Design a protein around this ligand. Structure first.
Ligand code: FAD
Ligand code: FAD
Ligand code: RH1
Ligand code: RH1
Lengths: 273, 273
C-alpha cells in the first residue's frame, strides 16, 4: 500500500473550512499509521512565479531563455532553486498526494498553479517518451479535495455553470495523469458557505472516514496510452485498429476523448469505467 | 464598434514568440486607429496572490477574513490596493481585451490566473443577480491568443491530450463569459517550438490581418441565461420547457452544457452558433 502522504493546501486563512479539511485529513491519516508531510503554500510564502531564477547555475543560452529546456538541464545537473528541490523531494517521498483548495475561477488558485509550473519539471515529473500511464508518478495516487461557492445543481448537466466533469479534466488528466498519477475520485464539497453548522461537521467526518481506505479505491478512467501511436511522426493519434473498433461504440472513452460521442456519466467524478 | 484595446501579456521573456505576438497585435490595432493599453504582468512586477493586503481600509471582520465579501466592500468604499484599482480602470475603459500567453499545464500561467483573482472583484466584474449574459462586461469582447508546445494533432479528438475544446471551456465560459464578455474565437498557434522561421513570420502576419476586422467577428456560442431559472431556489437549473425541447436535439448546447449528448464540433474554437 502506501505509508507516506503529502497534503498541498492553497488557502490563506487558518480559520477557513479548507484549513479545517487539511487538519481533518492529517489527523485521519496519522491514526491509520501514515507518514504525513504538508505544503501549506500561503504559510510557506511560496513563490508561484516561474523565472530564470529557478535555475541556480549558468544557463546554456542566457540570451534566449527557454524555461522547459533550461529547467530540465538544471534538474539533471543538480542546480534547480533549492525551494523547488525541497518540494520535489516531498513528491518523490509520497505515495499519496492530496490537493486541498477552494475552486477559484473554475480552476486551481494561482498559488497552486504556480506550484505545478515550478515543481513538475521535465524528466522529473514527466517524459515525452513515457506519457500518461507510464509516467514517473505511475506508482503514486492523487486526489483533489475542492470547496465551492456555487451549489452542486449549478454544476450538474443542466446547471448554468455546466458540467463539473469538464472543469475537472484539465487538472486531473492534463496535470496529474500526464505525469503518471493514478487519479482517485475527487472530494467535492459544494456551496460550503451556505451549509448548516451541523452539516459542516459531517462533511469533515465523512472526509476522515473516506481516507481510512483511500489507497484501495479504484482510480478514475483515462484512455490507456496503449491505444495511441506513441511517436512524433504519427502525431500521437489513436492507432487505426483501435479507431475502427471504437466506431461502433455508443460512448466515447472519457471527457477529453469523447470522440464526438456521448461522454460516460461522471467520468471525472466517479470511478469504474 | 470599439476603439480602446487592452492587451494582457503573461510571459517573462521579451525574446519569446508571445512577446512578438503582443507587439504584432499592438502595431496592427494602432494602425487601425485603436487606443492600446498594455498589462505586461511580469514587467509590472505584478503580485498574483490574493490576501487581505488587497484591502487598505479596515476589515468588517478581521477575525474571520472572507475575501469575496471584504473585497466587494472594499470596491464599494474605495479601499482596494493601488495596483488593483489601476487595472480595474484599464478594464473599465477597454472595449476589447486580448489575453496573450503560452499554454502552461493545460491552463493559463499562474501569474495571469492571479490577475483575474485580484482584479475581477464582485460588483465590479460580476454579480450573482446578473451572471453571464447580463454581466458588467456585456458590452466588451475578449479573445485568447495561445501558443503551445504540443502539436495540434495531440489536441484533436483522437490526440493523446484530448480535445482542446474541453481545455478552453473553464477559461472562456467560467472566467470571461461569466462576467458578461462576448468571447471571440481563440487564436491557437500549436507546436511553436517546431515551426520553421518562415512559417513563424506568417503566423505574425496572419494574426495582424485578423485584428483588422476583429470587432465584426461572430462570437463563440454559449447557452443564454434566458434558458435557466436564475434564482437560488431553482438551483439555477435549466427551465423545464427548455429541457424537454432540448431532448429532441442530437447535440448538446456547448462543451459545458453537453447534456450527456455529443458536443457540437469546435464549440470553443469556432463560431457559428
Ligand atoms: C478569487 C475567488 C474566485 C472564486 N471563484 C469561484 C468559482 O469559479 N466557482 C465557485 O463555485 N466558487 C468560487 N469562489 C468561492 C470559493 O470557492 C468559496 O468561497 C470557498 O470554497 C469557501 O470555503 P473556504 O474554506 O474558503 O472558506 P469559508 O467561507 O470560511 O467557509 C468555511 C465555513 O465553515 C465554517 N468553518 C470553518 N472551520 C470550521 C470547522 N473546523 N468546522 C465546521 N465549520 C467550520 C466557517 O465559519 C464558514 O462558515 C471564488 C472565491 C474567490 C475568493
Ligand atoms: C511550466 C510550463 C508548463 C507548460 N505546459 C504545457 C502544456 O500543458 N501543454 C503544451 O502544449 N505546452 C506546454 N508548455 C510549453 C509552452 O506552451 C511552450 O514552451 C510555449 O508556448 C512556447 O512559446 P514561447 O513564446 O514561450 O517561446 P519560444 O519557445 O521562444 O518560441 C518562440 C520561437 O519563435 C522565435 N521567435 C521569437 N520572436 C520572433 C519574432 N518576432 N519573429 C519570428 N520568430 C520569432 C524564437 O526564436 C523561437 O524559436 C509548458 C511550458 C512551461 C514552461
Ligand atoms: C461562480 C461563483 C463565484 N465565482 C466568483 C465568481 C462565487 O464567488 C460564488 C460565491 O462565493 C458563487 N456562489 C454564490 C453562488 C459562484 O457561483
Ligand atoms: C504536454 C506537453 C508539454 N507540457 C509540459 C508538459 C510540453 O512542454 C511540450 C514541449 O513542446 C510538449 N510537446 C512535446 C510535445 C507537450 O506535449
Amino acid at each position: 500500500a502506501g505509508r507516506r502522504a503529502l497534503i498541498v493546501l492553497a488557502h490563506s486563512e487558518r480559520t477557513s473550512f479548507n484549513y479545517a479539511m487539511k487538519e481533518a485529513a492529517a489527523a485521519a491519516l496519522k491514526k491509520k499509521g501514515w507518514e504525513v508531510v504538508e505544503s501549506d503554500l500561503y504559510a510557506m510564502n511560496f513563490n508561484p512565479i516561474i523565472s530564470r531564477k529557478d535555475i541556480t547555475g549558468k544557463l546554456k543560452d542566457p540570451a534566449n531563455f527557454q524555461y522547459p529546456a533550461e529547467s530540465v538541464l538544471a534538474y539533471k545537473e543538480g542546480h534547480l532553486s533549492p525551494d523547488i528541490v525541497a518540494e520535489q523531494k516531498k513528491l518523490e517521498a509520497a505515495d499519496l498526494v492530496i490537493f486541498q483548495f477552494p475552486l477559484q475561477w473554475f480552476g486551481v488558485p494561482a498559488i497552486l498553479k504556480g506550484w505545478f509550473e515550478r515543481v513538475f519539471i521535465g524528466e522529473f515529473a514527466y517524459t515525452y517518451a513515457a506519457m500518461y500511464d507510464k509516467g514517473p508518478f505511475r506508482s503514486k495516487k492523487a486526489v483533489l479535495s475542492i470547496t465551492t461557492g456555487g451549489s452542486g445543481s449549478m454544476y450538474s448537466l443542466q446547471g448554468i455553470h455546466g458540467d463539473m466533469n469538464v472543469i475537472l479534466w484539465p487538472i486531473q488528466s492534463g496535470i496529474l495523469h500526464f505525469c503518471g498519477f493514478q487519479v482517485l475520485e475527487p472530494q467535492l464539497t459544494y456551496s460550503i458557505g451556505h451549509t448548516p453548522a451541523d452539516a459542516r461537521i459531517q462533511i469533515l467526518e465523512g472526509w476522515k472516514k473516506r481516507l481510512e481506505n483511500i489507497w484501495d479505491e479504484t482510480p478514475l478512467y483515462f484512455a490507456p496510452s496503449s491505444l495511441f501511436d506513441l511517436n512524433f511522426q504519427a502525431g500521437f493519434l489513436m492507432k487505426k485498429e483501435v479507431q475502427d473498433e471504437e466506431k461502433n461504440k455508443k460512448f466515447g472513452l472519457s471527457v477529453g476523448h469523447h470522440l464526438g460521442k456521448s461522454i460516460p456519466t461522471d467520468n471525472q467524478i466517479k470511478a469504474r469505467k
